Design a protein around this ligand. Structure first.
Ligand SMILES: [Mg+2]
Ligand SMILES: [Mg+2]
Length: 92
């Protein structure tokens, strides 16, 4: 193995990238929970080594930054905890 995660590869309808220790990421997770949408989360801090580096580069390829949280739906994303932008992403 020789293997890769389905959700890393775009199969979630909604995907969050974050760190479990970050309060902006915590807030965004609680937003998504409350929203009631099926979503997945990748905690980059729970990854190590090349697997972590790969997810970091993926986050960058989506937002153009090395910051989190990033929430992705289809071809759109929100970088950071912003409730208005997250509601627009999920609902619009
Ligand atoms: Mg966008
Ligand atoms: Mg944004």
């Amino acid at each position: 193995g020789g293997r890769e995660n389905l959700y890393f590869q775009g199969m979630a309808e909604v995907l969050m990238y974050g760190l479990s220790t970050c309060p902006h990421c915590k807030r965004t997770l609680e937003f998504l929970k409350r929203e009631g949408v099926d979503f997945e989360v990748i905690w980059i801090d729970k990854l190590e080594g090349e697997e972590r580096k790969k997810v970091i580069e993926k986050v960058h390829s989506i937002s153009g930054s090395y910051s989190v949280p990033v929430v992705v739906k289809g071809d759109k994303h929100v970088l950071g905890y912003n409730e208005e932008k997250l509601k627009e992403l999920i609902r619009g």
